[PDB]
Write a protein that binds this ligand. Structure first.
Ligand SMILES: [Mg+2]
Ligand SMILES: [Mg+2]
Ligand SMILES: [Zn+2]
Lengths: 55, 227, 98, 110
RNA sequence: AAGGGCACCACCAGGAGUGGAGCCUGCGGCUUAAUUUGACUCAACACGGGAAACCUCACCCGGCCCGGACACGGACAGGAUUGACAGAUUGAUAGCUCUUUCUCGAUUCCGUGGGUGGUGGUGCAUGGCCGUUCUUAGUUGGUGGAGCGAUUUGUCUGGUUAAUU
């Protein structure tokens, strides 16, 4: 509060814009192919996403 | 046609939908023996199959719970109305499922008893359910203030190579006890035999089988049979 | 929370039409995605459903970043008494099909 | 039975005495669920928590006697977190702890 | 100590070097209101995917907000309360305060208990994940044998192999 200065700093581009879609953390974020997961959450969910360690 | 997504992004988004659906459905109906999900996507009304152990309480009273579950799925994932339907199937041989056995161990531990007794009971149930081998690990603040780990291996278990991708199955659970969490890790080696549903086909790569010959009698004096 | 009454009525009736409420956990979102015409921000939905949980009328679950809410039978009775609606109409999840 | 035992002890003896299981000791925390059932059970997979009504009853009874969670927990010889978990609908009920709370606050919880 | 075998994270035969110079970047120190913090032989130091103008952001200097559920009391349609134009005031077009009065309507406000959030502490309370011991060939039951026993044999003199092959 109030309305015209609460969230007024622009969260366009940059690390304050983007966050993990699982844990809402902002660091180590993989945004390739529109994953938008942090690297730890990606390692957790990569097998049932469809990514396999193959070589 | 109007809205388009490249195939890489499309397949990644499909995998992300499967992952989030599986995690939400794990978190929701864990006390019902969830044990995995299947999705059948089609360019029409899709289906999602829930492979529970006890389906009579996954379906609520007159199927109220399955109705509210398909409601929240359709409201979260932005499906159009009627394009998603949600099914339930009872899993056969619940003793061969790592997720169900890890949940059973969590249930026993939360109810409270010796960790030894619970792990022994789960292990022997897994063996007499038909597994080739099992391995149950419990780790955390056991009796004492310093953390230990205890494994209860039995039978047969492979660790390396490509056969351990499809021929065992694992599960990790956390148990929120009174003093920190315990970790549960259950691995079950599946049988091969029927080349059907209870296990996988294509047996272990270093297991050769040699068919036995027949009798092979009468190599004696020549005879000819005409027609 | 302040939440002028028409917003609370809107949130409650939408929870009553189908017995679920699927708001997303972020407070800086100017409209709920599917209310979106009654000028209801996401924060109001979050805090109203939190109050409903505290009285025990609604059970919640939490996915990755989303809230899910289910309306219990005490929730049916309370919403029925709050909306002054007659005691024969039901939410969609209670009965729509065979 | 007392009548049959005193009848047998006034004549030719056939009585049998035997020691109880937990006789002559104080187990401070009595177990709530029978481990014979809990080791046997494989199918049922859920634990019922305390209802919200029970937590509200504890809250109102405790607040009406000038008593806090710390003081109630110290009075019934438990940690404050188990009281705060009973009041918040999170803890699996224990009949022994529930009975201690009933004698502490004078209400009936079962 | 001896006897077998092995490895360019060992050596030999060498190649390209690094260590010297300018600069980039990471650590320590010093300085600072703050120069947030973890990691210190291999197994810390272009590592935390850590290329920070703001955000990130934890740290410093100031200033708003409640996003303090719920329960019980209190006060309350003769008003519980919510916003706000102008002046001052402020870094500020924060009605943040002060003057001034308008506006909203039971949602709030006050007290007690208690929620809730925390890139707050503790990795020497933990889970999971990872690294390392350890890139080598190693490890273990059952039944039998030996030994009072701890233990041992199986798992070996020899030849062979990248390998208890
Ligand atoms: Mg190999
Ligand atoms: Mg060297
Ligand atoms: Zn991820």
């Amino acid at each position: 509060g109030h309305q015209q200065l609460y969230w007024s700093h622009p969260r366009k581009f940059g690390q304050g814009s983007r966050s993990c879609r699982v844990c809402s953390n902002r660091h180590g974020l993989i945004r390739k192919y529109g994953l938008n997961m942090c690297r730890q959450c990606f390692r957790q969910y990569a097998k049932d996403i469809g990514f396999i360690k193959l070589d | 046609m109007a809205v388009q997504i490249s195939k890489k992004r499309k397949f990644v988004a499909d995998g992300i939908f499967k992952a989030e659906l599986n995690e939400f459905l794990t978190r929701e109906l864990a006390e019902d023996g969830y044990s995995g999900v299947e999705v059948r996507v089609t360019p029409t009304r899709t289906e999602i199959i829930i492979l529970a152990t006890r389906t009579q309480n996954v379906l609520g009273e007159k199927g109220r719970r399955i109705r509210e579950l398909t409601a929240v799925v359709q409201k979260r994932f932005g499906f159009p109305e009627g394009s998603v339907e949600l099914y339930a199937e009872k899993v056969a041989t619940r003793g061969l499922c790592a997720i169900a056995q890890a949940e059973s161990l969590r249930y026993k531990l939360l109810g409270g008893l010796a960790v030894r007794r619970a792990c022994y009971g789960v292990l022997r149930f897994i063996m007499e359910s038909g597994a080739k081998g099992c391995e149950v690990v419990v780790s955390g603040k056991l009796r004492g203030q310093r953390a230990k780990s205890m494994k209860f291996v039995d039978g047969l278990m492979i660790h390396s190579g490509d056969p351990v991708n499809y021929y065992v199955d694992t599960a990790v659970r956390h148990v929120l006890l009174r003093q920190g969490v315990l970790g549960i890790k259950v691995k079950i080696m599946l049988p091969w035999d029927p080349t059907g549903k209870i296990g996988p086909k294509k047996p272990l790569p270093d297991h050769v089988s040699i068919v036995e010959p027949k009798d092979e009698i009468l190599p004696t004096t020549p005879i000819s049979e005409q027609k | 929370m302040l939440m002028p009454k028409k917003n609370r009525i809107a949130i409650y009736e939408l929870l009553f039409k189908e017995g679920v409420m699927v708001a997303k956990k972020d407070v800086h979102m100017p409209k709920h995605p599917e209310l979106a015409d009654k000028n209801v921000p996401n924060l109001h939905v979050m805090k109203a459903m939190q109050s409903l949980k505290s009285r025990g009328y609604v059970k919640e679950q939490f996915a990755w970043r989303h809230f899910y809410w289910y309306l219990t039978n005490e929730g049916i009775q309370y919403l029925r008494d709050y909306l002054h609606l007659p005691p024969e109409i039901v939410p969609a999840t209670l009965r729509r099909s065979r | 039975s007392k009548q049959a035992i005193l009848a047998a002890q006034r004549r030719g003896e056939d009585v049998e005495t035997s020691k109880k299981w937990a006789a002559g000791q104080n187990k401070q925390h009595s177990i709530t669920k029978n481990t014979a059932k809990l080791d046997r059970e494989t199918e049922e997979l859920h634990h019922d928590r305390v209802t919200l009504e029970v937590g509200k009853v504890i809250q109102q009874g405790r607040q009406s006697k000038g008593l806090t969670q710390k003081d109630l927990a110290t009075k019934i010889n438990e940690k404050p977190q188990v009281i705060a978990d009973y009041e918040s609908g999170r803890a699996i009920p224990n009949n022994q702890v529930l009975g201690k709370i009933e004698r502490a606050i004078g209400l009936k919880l079962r």
